[PDB]
Amino acid sequence: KKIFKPEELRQALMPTLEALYRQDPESLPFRQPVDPQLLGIPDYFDIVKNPMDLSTIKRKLDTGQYQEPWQYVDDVWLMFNNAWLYNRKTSRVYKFCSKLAEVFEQEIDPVMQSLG
Ligand SMILES: CCOc1ccc(C(C)=O)cc1-c1cc(NC(=O)c2ccco2)cc(-c2c(N)noc2C)c1
Question: What is the number of residues in the chain?
Answer: 116
Task: Report how this structure was experimentally obtained.
Answer: X-ray
Residue nearest to atom 33 of ligand 1 (CA): 29
The CA-to-CA distance between both ends of the chain, in Å, stands at: 13
Answer whether 93 contacts ligand 1 (Cβ < 6 A). Answer: yes
Handedness of CA 79, 84, 90, 95 (dihedral sign): positive
Distances (CA, A) of 103 to 46, 76, 86, 92: 29, 12, 21, 17
What gap in Å lies between CA 66 and CA 82, rounded to an integer? 20
Residues 6+ apart with CB under 8 A from 73: 108, 112
How far apart (Å, rounded) are the C-alpha atoms in residues 100 and 108? 12
Q: Structure resolution in Å?
A: 2.1
Question: Is 106's C-beta closer than 6 angstroms to any atom of ligand 1?
Answer: no
Nearest residue to 30 via CA among 61, 65, 58? 58
- Domain 1-116: which CATH number of 2.40.50.140, 2.30.30.140, 1.20.920.10, 3.30.70.870: 1.20.920.10
